[PDB]
């Protein structure tokens, strides 16, 4: 590993099982916390209610596009109290 | 009976714009192709040129089963009753133009 | 052709009008109710649980599965009759009226 | 018939009229009773609030994928007191 | 030729300009709307359910079926008039304006 | 500028960020107000739930095909209290 | 006008503002009184709590599908004491 | 009337770039070739040289039906009204330069 | 060929049958779960985050990505065994039963 | 059997009509050409002068194994029964134009 | 060539690599954001609302319209610089890093 | 100035590579062929054999404007500044080789 | 060792069926063509006539590396182990047939 | 070195099998013809008489720089090593059927 977009697709799968279907609030304030803004998140949320497409897939790959590490995904999975997720992406290191 | 060489352009064209069109329950050419005993790859590298139904007929002509009634009985068998009806007459016709003619000797 | 009658062929239908009686059957899973109502002569379901799913996936492409089904069940000649007689019988009176304003009762 | 996925599409239609729109509870405890687990049913519930897609359709076909009979559908339509439904799938036998 | 007018011939139209009024008719199945609007003198549909699926096929090849249809219905002379007269009458004002800014009203 | 379809594609981009993801009501009453009709809008609505395609993109381009000006887009972005949009299409005039 | 589904989309909009958001009972017994049945309205009610979709829109269009006039909508907007609505659909006649 | 030999180059050229170009509803040369009673394989083994329409005329010349009005009546019958209009004049012409001339004896 | 067995080649599979066990793996992102289950000999993921994306995009074209992937992982010979053994092990018993009704237990 | 020369005009033409419909999925003149032990570039050449079936039967007619016996049992291998059910008559007739006229004249 | 630098020509780019930074720009309409970012020297939009629609149509054919546009805006030489300087400036750091790990800051 | 005959193969080849691949907004050979005053009809019966850029040249040489210069000022009017930079030297060269020779008299 | 001329039709055909169909992650002919040191521009003007794997070969033989061996070690570096196993014998054979002959001197 | 005449039959044919596989992407007899200083229309002519590599080496055999030395160093430039690792033996042997027999007879 190294970058978000270099996560093995199952690892990303298990991790888009969390954040995805995970409390319209518990997620929404992870997203708003991804250095994003009002208008942008309006797009990336719309995507939810279309033929099963991981809103966190899209949020994650789009943070990929912006050169996000994986240590930054880990970081903000604790500084947001969503350990439930990082539990999996430490089964990798 | 006789080889596809019998039926030409006129119907090959019609015939085409029936089976060229990929359907979900019905038989598109690929279904047919299958029955005329064609391998996997053969079918796919045929799913390329426009008008593969024609490109199918002409690949399965210098071939064993190559009859016209053979294709005919196939179509009937694949439940494409629609084709042998807006086309049936037009074929036992292009079989005449070939039986009567090319037989002046 | 022009004078649409309960004797003409489905697959013979203008591609302008199909994209039109599409908008009736298309929304509210209307065609699903149609799809299963289509039965071969034996009596058995024409399209089954599986075929249905196929059509469903043509929403991701943006194609009237009314059409893709309509054309597709056209490959058995089925009269425009067969269509309304199956439109009425399934309560699709507004489309069946567009076809032929004959057998279209009034609630 | 034989397998779930071998139900004629209207039979499954009239049966996805039941379980589908049928008491957030009287359904949810049928699903949880399909030998599933907490995480999985989180997905298959999400699907309900998307352009009319039978949550039981999806629960049924997914039981399909796992070789479910149809005698197991009937069985658990009684052992769950949802006769209202099985009364249709006995009009077939 | 140069001074395009409602008397000139469709199939005589510059290959640059067609690939241009292509981009009007081409997306949102715009040409489908045109295709069935094209009628023989008899009144009967020019292209029918089957012809049209042929054109649809020419997207897998990347061909303006606005064009492939345009050329193809050019083999009956049809005036550049018949074109806009059928463009306007089908609400394709933007393309028909590029043809001849004559009969192109304003909402 | 002058006609709808003559809008530079970013300007249409920014404006397909508004109307697009903007209250299924605040949009649909703009659509219905574009001189359209019941049956037409049913098409133009369906398109929303398919691989990210701006419902306003297609509504606007389709008003394009109809020789719509640009002063009629601005007009109807006031007479409908959707200033939030026209704010960008005045950054061009 | 003539048929339900031949209502101009704004007129149906103003009319889907009423019955839609309008007392879960003042609504429900207009629906129940649309010649419908227990099972059916189960579906058409579920639709309400999805991405803003006029449950009267779908109840109206669905009465459309069954050749409903417009004089039958007005009729049953008085014989149900919901004049509040037909007051708009007489601004058309 | 007279044989193809009458109409030369000038029109054979024009004539060609109408019917050499393959159409979906209209008649390409293939449709014509069909009409001039040509086998299947005959047509295909002709879909090879560029300018098949010429190579069609040339093959259906030392042949039965070989008229020019014959071809002419065919074109009008295949609903190719466009060709016999940007071309009609120029043929009743190449028919004159042959009738008047080659008749000085 | 005809007698499909846990020894034959995947890429050898009739194109009729593929379009058929397509219907199993195809819906509910079933193939995504299979995609990531396919692993090289090394152990490393065969297809990665990026590859998967590729396939996703074949829904816009209307292609069985079960097939598009199936053909594509066929270019490594992988026995029809490797397929069920990967079908069962991933809980796709219904399609695996279609291949070879041997190793397909009963809940 | 006997040298290729035996074969009249007719058939060396139909023979060509059939074997040079190029089909990359079944068996064309090339798949034959290769059974007559021609090299690659040898075929890429034939692939030039149109009617290469003919030109193949020329570049062969005088060679080691080249007979009509071979051409036939070669078509038989390829399974182009297409042509065996079609030139079979004209050819056992064309053997007796060279045979029943080569013990007298 | 081999040593890709901000001086080399875009249209000179390995066909393997293209299909690779295609996977970055390709999804989430990434390339639409790039297409409108490409501007002639005048300042005016390079591709306009109509051009863009052309590209969009190449999804029904299955063509990287990242590429089809990459190639196509290659016919004005544009340095691999102009590409990153347009990739960075539009926030596509992941792809521009692949090109030249020079000017690729970190959040 | 000097006609197309001036520049050959090598350059006519490299010039193909660039204008033969059809493109979305930049100008491909069709956009050119049009700029050399060819008809919508003539252009299609071009898009037929491969190397149409090359055939386009052969076809626009025994015509009017056909300068090497025309071809170039055309290429720039059409903003194919890519083709120019890359074939620039190679054309000026192929000219100092025609004018070069074609002189001893 | 031996050049591409070594192996023909039959194999060149079967080779096509495998690498002509473009795939997502496994290597198709392009991935190869690149491995054979071809430019982004040359490759496109290949993706143009059918059989470009076959065209790719014709075009990589009158060049350097062109071994049959290079063709193989490449196919294997590209992990198309499917094409290897299935064409394996057919290639070794078509070499024991070039080397075989092309020897009496 | 020595006049082209040196080269016997064998190679003047193999030389042709190789250089007139026309390939628009790599280096064929045309890209050679232009290295032997032939004008455009000069090649357009050769492009007729099939076997034009031969006919090229004829219209050259007697000219200014025309030697086997040249033809070799010319295929060396175009990098058609295809032919240099194949005719190289037969040619340094064909120089000594005109060398080792041109100081005696």
From Swiss-Prot, chains A, D, F, G:
Transmembrane feature ranges: none
Top-rank taxon, per record: Eukaryota
Death domain span: 12-93
Tissue localization of expression: Expressed in spleen, thymus, prostate, lung, liver, skeletal muscle, kidney, pancreas and peripheral blood leukocytes.
Family label: Belongs to the protein kinase superfamily. TKL Ser/Thr protein kinase family. Pelle subfamily.
Function in brief: Binds to the IL-1 type I receptor following IL-1 engagement, triggering intracellular signaling cascades leading to transcriptional up-regulation and mRNA stabilization.
UniProt free text on domains: The protein kinase domain is predicted to be catalytically inactive.
Quaternary context: Interacts with MYD88. IL-1 stimulation leads to the formation of a signaling complex which dissociates from the IL-1 receptor following the binding of PELI1.
Protein name: Interleukin-1 receptor-associated kinase-like 2
Gene assigned in the entry: IRAK2
Range of the intact protein held here: 2 to 94 of 625
From Swiss-Prot, chains B, H, J, L, M, N:
Subcellular location: Cytoplasm; Nucleus
Domain Death: 36-91
Tissue localization of expression: Ubiquitous.
The record's account of how the chain is modified after translation: Ubiquitinated; undergoes 'Lys-63'-linked polyubiquitination. OTUD4 specifically hydrolyzes 'Lys-63'-linked polyubiquitinated MYD88. Deubiquitinated by USP3 that cleaves 'Lys-63'-linked ubiquitin chains leading to inhibition of MYD88-induced NF-kappa-B signaling.
Effect caused by changing residue 16 to Y: Rare variant; uncertain significance; loss of NF-kappa-B complex activation; loss of interaction with IRAK4; reduces homooligomerization
Disease linkage: Immunodeficiency 68: An autosomal recessive primary immunodeficiency characterized by life-threatening, often recurrent, pyogenic bacterial infections, including invasive pneumococcal disease, beginning in infancy or early childhood.
Quaternary context: Homodimer. Also forms heterodimers with TIRAP. Binds to TLR2, TLR5, IRAK1, IRAK2 and IRAK4 via their respective TIR domains. Interacts with IL18R1. Interacts with BMX, IL1RL1, IKBKE and IRF7. Interacts with LRRFIP1 and LRRFIP2; this interaction positively regulates Toll-like receptor (TLR) signaling in response to agonist. Interacts with FLII. LRRFIP1 and LRRFIP2 compete with FLII for MYD88-binding. Interacts with IRF1. Upon IL1B treatment, forms a complex with PELI1, IRAK1, IRAK4 and TRAF6; this complex recruits MAP3K7/TAK1, TAB1 and TAB2 to mediate NF-kappa-B activation. (Microbial infection) In case of infection, interacts with uropathogenic E.coli protein TcpC; suppressing Toll-like receptor (TLR)-mediated cytokine production.
Domain notes: The intermediate domain (ID) is required for the phosphorylation and activation of IRAK.
Protein name (record): Myeloid differentiation primary response protein MyD88
Organism: Homo sapiens
Lineage: Eukaryota, Metazoa, Chordata, Craniata, Vertebrata
Location of this fragment in the whole protein: 20 to 117 of 296
Swiss-Prot record, chains C, E, I, K:
The protein's name in its UniProt record: Interleukin-1 receptor-associated kinase 4
Parent-protein residues present: 4 to 106 of 460
Domain of life: Eukaryota
Illness association: Immunodeficiency 67: An autosomal recessive primary immunodeficiency characterized by recurrent, life-threatening systemic and invasive bacterial infections beginning in infancy or early childhood.
UniProt subcellular location: Cytoplasm
Functional note: Serine/threonine-protein kinase that plays a critical role in initiating innate immune response against foreign pathogens. Involved in Toll-like receptor (TLR) and IL-1R signaling pathways. Is rapidly recruited by MYD88 to the receptor-signaling complex upon TLR activation to form the Myddosome together with IRAK2. Phosphorylates initially IRAK1, thus stimulating the kinase activity and intensive autophosphorylation of IRAK1. Phosphorylates E3 ubiquitin ligases Pellino proteins (PELI1, PELI2 and PELI3) to promote pellino-mediated polyubiquitination of IRAK1.
Annotated GO MF terms: ATP binding; interleukin-1 receptor binding; kinase activity; magnesium ion binding; protein kinase binding; protein serine kinase activity; protein serine/threonine kinase activity
GO cellular-component term (any): extrinsic component of plasma membrane
UniProt keyword annotations, A-Z: Acetylation, ATP-binding, Cytoplasm, Disease variant, Immunity, Innate immunity, Kinase, Magnesium, Nucleotide-binding, Phosphoprotein, Serine/threonine-protein kinase, Transferase
Gene name as annotated: IRAK4
UniProt organism field: Homo sapiens (Human)
Lineage, opening ranks: Eukaryota, Metazoa, Chordata, Craniata, Vertebrata
